[PDB]
Amino acid sequence: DFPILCQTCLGENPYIRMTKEKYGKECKICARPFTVFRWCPGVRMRFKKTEVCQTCSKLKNVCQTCLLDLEYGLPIQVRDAGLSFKDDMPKSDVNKEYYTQNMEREISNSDGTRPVGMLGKATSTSDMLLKLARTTPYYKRNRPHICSFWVKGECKRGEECPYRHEKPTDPDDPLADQNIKDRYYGINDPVADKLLKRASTMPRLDPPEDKTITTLYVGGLGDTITETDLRNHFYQFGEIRTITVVQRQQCAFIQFATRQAAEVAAEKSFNKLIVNGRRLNVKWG
């Protein structure tokens, strides 16, 4: 009873009518019958319905319809590229059936609210994916499918047509093909790969222009801030060597015992840290 859901599926209305079938469909993964839920998300929306059984969601920690993580809204291949691939799960036939069975007993014996072993891992995060995690609901995802009479030029329902009248996606784009099983296991997922390419460009971690340099060239200081903000932020890292301050261009230089600590302060800092409700931007030299 009650599905497991994204906030993005469930709807942008707080009031929702949602129907239930006892054994509605096989799950497209572990292939068992399971309680299925439909509901209307919104005014122009599509009537989504749960695609996979609740168990294999608890297993990989995901929405039932979307298969996007609960916290990050990221396809599974991504958050695995983000932490731990070694979760695994047999893809192969009768194994899948077997492992699902056992893991279904293991889950039965848990407190109920926890994605099994992954959650022991799931706490430690934020490497990148937080910064590539999506922020707001994305409703373009629930729109009705593309009317396929109209996309041949004919559709004779006129304005009534609940489907959507517009140009489809060119089958050329590798982002088209998108199997379900595939998106689930984290194989060759085009979306996930795209997000990976997007991850790399994040100006961030390579640093190291020069050896031993712990000099921090800090842009976007501002004249509200004091140094004491700086120190009481940065004593976490280690033994400071010193701090140079310039308020004429509002840039603050810093120096630490080891370069390692400076890299760190970059990492922890870059395009993340803000104090005095004002962004504190960092660069090398």
Binding site: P90, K91, S92, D93, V94, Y99
Partner: peptide, 29 residues
Amino acid sequence: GVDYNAEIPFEKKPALGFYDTSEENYQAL
């Protein structure tokens, strides 16, 4: 057919006990 040569038939990842198995990996043939 692929329950053998593709994907490890049924998998029991060994249970983990008071020691570190993280590091260990093994060589090819």
